[PDB]
Design a protein around this ligand. Sequence first.
Ligand SMILES: C[C@H]1[C@H](C)CC[C@]2(C(=O)O)CC[C@]3(C)C(=CC[C@@H]4[C@@]5(C)CC[C@H](O)C(C)(C)[C@@H]5CC[C@]43C)[C@H]12
Ligand SMILES: C[C@H]1[C@H](C)CC[C@]2(C(=O)O)CC[C@]3(C)C(=CC[C@@H]4[C@@]5(C)CC[C@H](O)C(C)(C)[C@@H]5CC[C@]43C)[C@H]12
Lengths: 232, 235
Amino acid sequence: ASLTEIEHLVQSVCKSYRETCQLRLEDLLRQRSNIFSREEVTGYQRKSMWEMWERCAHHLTEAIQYVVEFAKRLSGFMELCQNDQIVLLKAGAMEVVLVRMCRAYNADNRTVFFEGKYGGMELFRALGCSELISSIFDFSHSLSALHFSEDEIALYTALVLINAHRPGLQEKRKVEQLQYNLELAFHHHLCKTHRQSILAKLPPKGKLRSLCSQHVERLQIFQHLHPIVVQA
Amino acid sequence: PYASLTEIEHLVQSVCKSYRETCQLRLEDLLRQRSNIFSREEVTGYQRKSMWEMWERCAHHLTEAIQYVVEFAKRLSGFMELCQNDQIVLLKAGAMEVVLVRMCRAYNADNRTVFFEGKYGGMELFRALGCSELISSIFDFSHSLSALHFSEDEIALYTALVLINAHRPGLQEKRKVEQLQYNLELAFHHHLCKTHRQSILAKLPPKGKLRSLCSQHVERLQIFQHLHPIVVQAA
Ligand SMILES: C[C@H]1[C@H](C)CC[C@]2(C(=O)O)CC[C@]3(C)C(=CC[C@@H]4[C@@]5(C)CC[C@H](O)C(C)(C)[C@@H]5CC[C@]43C)[C@H]12
Ligand SMILES: C[C@H]1[C@H](C)CC[C@]2(C(=O)O)CC[C@]3(C)C(=CC[C@@H]4[C@@]5(C)CC[C@H](O)C(C)(C)[C@@H]5CC[C@]43C)[C@H]12
């Protein structure tokens, strides 16, 4: 495609992101000084595994709704058939949530914004999967080190989601073409803003998939269907 | 392993129990409201609404009804043993089909009205949807279902088989679904036998009828930029 087309794709992906970013970055940043006390930590830690999983499913669900609304504003995505839309969301909506997560993560003290205050990974002890949790914290930590702008997140997440490697696609060449255009958009934007250097520092592609499918598997143990599926 | 009388009886109970806990609205509450009918002015207030407003309302009722159907599925212990892919295939194909069966409970065959947003109204309430043939078709279908005079337990067992259908294309563990379907069939037939209700079997909606009605609604939702309503979307 032309320069004008690539520019228009950059603008439309960032617009769609901006409209669906769930919480404003400034609100997340302002809250950084607001940290759970030890007593509040041990209040979280003493909760039933069932209660913590319920909370964490509910945050996952709500964050995924914003990601599906992101996908719905990418005119490329609304052109795909229904099965291919489901395939991309089922594999990618939760991966996008885990990238967006880095906005709510404070690298200075290794804490995340969770339910009104920042807390460290020990807040989630009642989840009973401390290796998974610690790895999630390492992944967000590696993302924080890139210092993403809002627009880099938009462009990077569009690529996470519009992904021709997902198994089960029916219009693979079409998804490949959309993905190709989105890579051009991302690359162009980074060159224009003197930020090409991040491309070599992005996490290995399978890392994100592995972190998500371990979450999905724990949700399944706790009787929650894939969080793309409407439940209550 | 061929299920005992006790095993099949226990299956009848657990399906009816799951239904009862997720039936969304109580039958009594629906029936009591039958005397409460939209006025002509209220009807034309519906009809003047934008296509986008009425599709928003109808998508919203569909979604919420599907959530109760999904919760129905999650309580069928057979269904939680299925793999993730099969769970999706069955709900994508069957959750809204269950909704269109459950709808008959909100349908009054005496005057062909449906309970919608606090009062009963005829199909003309839905004119702004711009698919009058489809809506007329849905009313005929609910009318035909109402003739059967279903009990809640019959809706429970019928709708479990709407969902657990081993012929849905794309199933990866077809054998597992066939096993579940066969027991649900025994459970439904056993219950109908015991209550002298087997005559309803020949009268159940033809193969594909439910599917065609759901696929038409999904297509219209898709025209109005709503993905398949099994997929979580703006709250
Ligand atoms: C993605 C962001 C969003 C941009 C803003 C709101 C968000 C929220 O739901 O509050 C902030 C916290 C995390 C990171 C959000 C969603 C999911 C996670 C999650 C439940 C993800 C799985 C993890 O293992 C863990 C339990 C640590 C987090 C906690 C932070 C949460 C709950 C939301
Ligand atoms: C299934 C029941 C439930 C047992 C009780 C609550 C229910 C509700 O959502 O209020 C009653 C009405 C219908 C039948 C319900 C769900 C969807 C339908 C639907 C939108 C289905 C599609 C049809 O074309 C039509 C537009 C006529 C109906 C309207 C009534 C509704 C909105 C709910």
